[PDB]
Design a protein around this ligand. Sequence first.
Ligand SMILES: COC(=O)c1c(O)cccc1OCCCCNC(=O)[C@H](Cc1ccc(OCC(=O)O)c(O)c1)NC(C)=O
Length: 282
Amino acid sequence: EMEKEFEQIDKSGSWAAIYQDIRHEASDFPCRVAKLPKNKNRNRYRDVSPFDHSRIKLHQEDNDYINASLIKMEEAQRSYILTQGPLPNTCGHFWEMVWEQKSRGVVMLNRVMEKGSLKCAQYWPQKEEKEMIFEDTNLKLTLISEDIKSYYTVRQLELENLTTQETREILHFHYTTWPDFGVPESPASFLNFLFKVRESGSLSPEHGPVVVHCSAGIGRSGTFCLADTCLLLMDKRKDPSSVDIKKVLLEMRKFRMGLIQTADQLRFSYLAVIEGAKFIMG
Ligand SMILES: COC(=O)c1c(O)cccc1OCCCCNC(=O)[C@H](Cc1ccc(OCC(=O)O)c(O)c1)NC(C)=O
């Protein structure tokens, strides 16, 4: 399978090379809207922008920009919205996107503070009695319940459109033990987290695209979506060994830049997929 290739790359210690090999072949499209001066304060990293063709547009006549990309995998029949961790002034935009895109789940793969620094705003209420209201996009957010586990937390939230008093349940999956720029020692916990997301229905067709993010929404977020899509493919195809992870990644990079930030994450993606495969086949 892809495991065969794994050893090959591992025994010859050529990951770094194979990873750079993908960076060179990766797609490159314009990000003009993201670069407008008008949107300077809406971007966390100047080097991490959404392409124009695949960017998510907010549904407002004001400024429709938000650093977020719709990754649409045709064959896998799955779509994901990869975005940056919300900034102090984009939290309203963030929840507007979730509402407008009909998303059921939000997957956060980073902690608010990492390496002693702020990597994202506290964009969701931490206490039931303290609901948040985003005045700029006229939305109300409320913590309904919370389940704290060893390496991840699942929060049930309620998002309400104050314009129409319409309400929806949003599931928040918080992977809290993923070292920044690194990868877990064992993919098991990662995979276990992925399946929890799958079991909630948030990745299903009857719902809008799941919202995935870390700090930049490319490294850890990339690893999450690459593994999910790969497993889904082996699951659907008549040949579970026909799934080319490198092909899947590149196909994803057509929609957002920098997916998979280090050769290590690439190696981890291979592991996560290979291991997750053991389940996909009985
Ligand atoms: C490796 O670079 C690429 O693949 C790449 C490319 O090929 C083409 C265009 C852009 C690319 O990627 C561009 C990213 C370059 C790396 N730059 C940085 O460290 C940060 C942004 C960043 C990136 C990944 C992160 O974690 C992700 C995680 O692990 O969860 C993160 O927290 C923050 N920028 C600055 C200057 O503060």
